[PDB]
Amino acid sequence: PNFSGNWKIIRSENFEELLKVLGVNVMLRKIAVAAASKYAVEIKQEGDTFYIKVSTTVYTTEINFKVGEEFEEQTVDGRPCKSLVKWESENKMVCEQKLLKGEGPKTSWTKELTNDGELIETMTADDVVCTQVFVRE
Ligand SMILES: *C/C=C(C)/C=C/C=C(C)/C=C/C1=C(C)CCCC1(C)C
């Protein structure tokens, strides 16, 4: 596969329900759903090394990892975590997270390249799954 590209969001489902699981109050959940409508992902893949830049209108973050080696990022609601990415198949990776301090719901994410040229990202908290679909810019 090659995940590299500038990806633009075309669909986003269940994001508000994910944030509710994470304890975000109602008004901020709605504002965040609106922000996710400008969600853009820039990926550069070199083998199993990934450089990913995730951004909205006012915020941008970089996530750099190599498949199979632990790294530190943050969960969706912003708590620091230790993460480990593995392949599930040729075109799908899955990341398990574990909080660096304290307790909280079990979180994870996936990225998948479909045969139709889409990028599907999922984010999970407990048993609520958010699905976001992107196309190349
Ligand atoms: C492989 C993809 C990864 C690691 C993406 C992570 C994305 C996020 C933590 C996104 C968070 C967002 C918010 C909390 C509010 C604004 C909209 C998002 C989706 C960018």
The whole domain housing 125 covers 1-137
Q: Which CATH number is 73's domain given? A: 2.40.128.20
56 with 36: CB under 8 angstroms? yes
Bridge partners (DSSP) listed for residue 81: 73, 99
Domains in the chain, number = 1
Q: Which residues line ligand 1 (CB under 6 A)?
A: 32, 35-36, 39, 52, 54, 56, 63, 76, 109, 111, 121
Write the DSSP symbol of residue 15: H
Write the DSSP symbol of residue 90: T
Closest C-alpha to 103, from 81, 124, 87: 81
CA–centroid distance, residue 98 to ligand 1 (Å): 17
Which residue type does 74 have? Q
Residue with tokens 């590299």: 4
Our mutation pick for probing the ligand 1 site, out of 72, 123, 131, counting the most ligand atoms within 8 A of Cβ, is 123
Q: How would you classify the pairing of strands 60-66 and 107-113?
A: unpaired
